[PDB]
Amino acid sequence: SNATVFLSGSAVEYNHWETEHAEQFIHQLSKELIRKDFNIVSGFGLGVGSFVINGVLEELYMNQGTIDDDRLILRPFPQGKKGEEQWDKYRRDMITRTGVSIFLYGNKIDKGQVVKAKGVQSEFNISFEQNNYVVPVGATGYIAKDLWNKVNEEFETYYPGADARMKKLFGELNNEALSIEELINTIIEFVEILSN
């Protein structure tokens, strides 16, 4: 049954979408996950985490709810050298309660240049190591695209025994022509199948 997902991602740019449009996508994806009775773990990634929070708080507070209901589990990363020493252990810890991991975007500024986000790759590896189903949203580009290609290349390793609907939905995760609503509905239906 629908349980807890890890929502992985970071961004300073959003492939073919303007920032405000990608923010709406992340906000509405997070809201729809809540409305479908999922819980979310988020590491508050730059360019992503704030909009996850925004979508969840909209749904909670329209219902006089509370962040203490643990629909959204927040694990912001400690910044600086001491913090970085714990990031691997912290990731392995925070992913434990999740069973499905979703990957979005994955890019950051390093030395004044936009580069791929290795932390999203690390979260993919950790997720797979505990036998989570992984959901790389290739249409969002960057690491998520690399991960989508990796999974596509060894599909039966990641989704053994998948049915035709799963295969179609997986392909649509990489369809850059889909609207926000169409891409969200693809992700949600795929994650529901993987949770059931």
Added chain:
Amino acid sequence: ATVFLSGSAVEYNHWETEHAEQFIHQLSKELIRKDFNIVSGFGLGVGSFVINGVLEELYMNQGTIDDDRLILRPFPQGKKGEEQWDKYRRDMITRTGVSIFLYGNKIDKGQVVKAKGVQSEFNISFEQNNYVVPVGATGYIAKDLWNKVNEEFETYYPGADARMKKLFGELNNEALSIEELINTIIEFVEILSN
């Protein structure tokens, strides 16, 4: 007992940056050791060190972040997030019974200014009938709040005894070492927590 840890900083009064970070780290670690839980809003200059101190204790004692000894509520940044900040603060402080205030400064209009968000969290704490622990020795908003409470002491700590009054005074003693200031804070919280 669950405490709200309020604070933000881009500078740290008289202290060397790493020493102030270590103070925040060690305060958080010793709160965990003395069996408190912490709610943190992940304030700039503060939140990372709260996390560092808690993780150090948890991960040397076979612990997990899921035991909710440290409850994290990072703030959504941007215009939409700002619209929810007051409701988010009132929400996250609800489960706490005591609030601690550290530092409280930020950049505004190119300048280091006192952090109004820490003042807002003080007012919410008071409105929810939390006890307040303003660590005046850390300067900035926390010192303003220490002075305010000191001037209206019986409003905030009715019926306090000599020991409580001594500890409250020591919260503003800038001569104390890191460990002495931490011990003052936690012994005061222990009184306020029953």
